Symmetry: C2
Subunit: 378 residues, 2 copies
């Protein structure tokens, strides 16, 4: 958890980009009453929980979504007072913490409510929990999967208003970013069938991740759980290239050369001696490694130095890596991992493709050992 | 950086294991004057910088190695007073911080020393830096590669004792964990050749990572930079199971089921609907995802529940994943990712093999969102 402020490896977060992305979605929503609850789980997708919450609030966020009770508590402790929804399951033993901090909880079973009521009944002066019922419409993760148990949960909260405030109902789509919308339409029809058994809807009815808001807006309820698009990234990677408005990428990554040398032919570079240089090759060393989240699978990809693509050669080490340079550069020369250099640019999508993963994972894997530097809001 | 204390996902760190590992290497070293500087970079290989420093101190550590000046400063701020060596390059502009905190610095070029002296000359009351010259004997990472520059660096420090204390000289091996020792002996001969031309050796002369101390102990200098083996893990993965003393793995990983359901045939699970269930399959949901460092590449591997293997099915999500259960289990049932369950066990080496990487990366990629729980010392 030590932050490497003195090391010249940095994550750059453009808060103006985040502000514009959110404002564009608000514009996209005009003519409805739909509000935006930015999704800030996983340290705001690696961008930094509190700084992203600050700009999101300035940009017009009406509430927040997180993965864990601990993340919601962290927002409350930073003096945010908006509604906060924990999207994962919180065990019933923690309901007193949630109720005392007005944290809204996702509930996917009648059993959870029964257990929570047994606990709450023993708490003097208990104040009601704000509950969102999670409906599993085909993601298979958490939530109710039939009408009967859903209505039983609805009835149980009505029987115990001293413990439960039915605040929301929601589902999540597995394929809203798929060029084939067959399964999305199946899930949307299934959610609509299931929520139809509720005699009265709660104040929040929501289904939309970024992809749903971007490409299936007619299916929006009255909250957008805006995640990846807030950070300026296409939810689909490249599968659905066209967007209803432009996304401005918020995150860049930079470092510097800390060592530069020229080597003779056959010189072995890195662990396992897996790379052998050519004659007169220039090798640059960079203080970034797999402990920072630049995993060994990134060997053979390129960084940008002075507008030139430079291959990562040999094995990536825990804290350092080596690149092939086209000529001698001074120690301290900027290296661009993500972002623009010269007339070129390395995107998170292109890195995700090289790593055989998705950009969500690239940014979420960035270690807190790398300091985040923010533009501030113009 | 928000730690998930309320989530039932935890890393278990056995400090007694670390103590025994260090004590076994100390016994392995008896009859020499060699001391151990445990390597604590990357938050002590994901185990926790300060708790591992505390037990390593209790077990007989004489000093510490880290990757970054920031990590060394964190150790000083936790009131550790032993020598601390930064193994990576620290840029010359930070020498006042290293000098004011008695942090020893790796230096790999005469140019670094020249730039450092220009800075230090402008500092009233400057106190000398403790320098280790890093020699590149064939790793190709950082360090001197020729006799002339090394001797020029030695003479330059002697011209400026107000700024520099020549405290150590070292190299690092690329293939000390290789059953073939050919390149290892080439590096060792090359280092011995370069150090032989120093007019006088400094107080620390060191070459040894874990693999060197385990399988090439005759080549030890007077300090062991003990890394992975301190954490109970074989430096070679599975390439060299033959060890001089047993290693006790220090790290386990455990979670709980937060949701359990039985699904109909054809039910699709996870993002992209990539897994289709068979009739009556039991699906468990676990609050662990790729944002915690259980990356998407782990889909299809197994966890242990109640002594039985359970496949991670479908895509792993940012904060959650789904497994196939052999039968219904209660919510709250323990899940073992690393460690023992029943008559079975999952090791970090097995998981690294599944992930096409090394166990070093698995442990360094564990997010701080997972709390570490420590046994303490008997």
């Amino acid at each position: 958890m030590t932050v490497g402020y003195l090391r010249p490896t940095r994550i750059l977060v453009d808060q103006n980009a985040i502000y514009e992305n959110i404002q564009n979605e608000l514009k996209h929503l005009e003519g409805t009453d739909t509000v935006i609850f930015p999704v800030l789980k996983a340290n705001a997708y690696g961008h930094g929980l509190i700084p992203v919450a600050e700009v999101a609030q300035a940009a017009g966020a009406s509430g927040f979504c997180v993965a864990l009770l601990d993340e919601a508590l962290a927002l409350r402790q930073a003096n945010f007072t908006e509604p906060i929804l924990v999207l994962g399951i919180t065990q019933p033993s923690e309901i007193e913490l949630a109720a005392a901090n007005q944290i809204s909880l996702t509930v996917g079973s009648l059993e959870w409510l029964q257990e929570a009521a047994e606990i709450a009944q023993r708490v003097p002066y208990f104040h009601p929990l704000h509950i969102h019922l999670g409906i599993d419409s085909g993601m298979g993760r958490i939530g109710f999967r039939d009408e009967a148990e859903l209505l039983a949960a609805d009835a149980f909260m009505k029987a115990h208003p001293e413990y439960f405030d039915f605040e929301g109902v929601f589902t999540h789509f597995a394929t809203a970013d798929d060029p084939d919308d067959t399964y999305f339409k199946e899930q949307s029809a299934r959610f609509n069938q299931l929520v139809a058994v509720l005699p009265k809807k709660p104040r929040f009815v929501h289904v939309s991740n970024s992809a749903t808001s971007l490409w299936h807006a007619a299916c929006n309820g009255n909250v957008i759980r805006m995640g990846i698009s807030l950070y300026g990234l296409n939810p689909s990677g490249a599968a659905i290239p066209d967007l209803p408005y432009p996304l401005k990428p918020a995150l860049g990554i930079e470092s510097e050369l800390v060592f530069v040398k020229q080597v003779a032919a056959g010189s072995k570079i890195g662990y396992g001696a897996t790379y052998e240089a050519s004659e007169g090759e220039w090798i640059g060393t960079i203080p970034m490694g797999y402990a920072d989240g630049w995993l060994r699978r990134m060997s053979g990809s390129t960084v940008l130095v002075d507008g030139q693509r430079c291959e990562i050669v040999g094995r990536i080490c825990m804290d350092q890596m080596m690149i092939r340079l086209p000529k001698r550069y001074p120690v301290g020369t900027k290296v661009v991992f993500v972002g623009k250099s010269g007339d070129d640019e390395i995107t998170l999508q292109e890195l995700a493709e090289y790593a055989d993963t998705i950009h969500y994972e690239i940014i979420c894997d960035l270690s807190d050992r790398i300091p985040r530097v923010y533009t501030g809001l113009n």
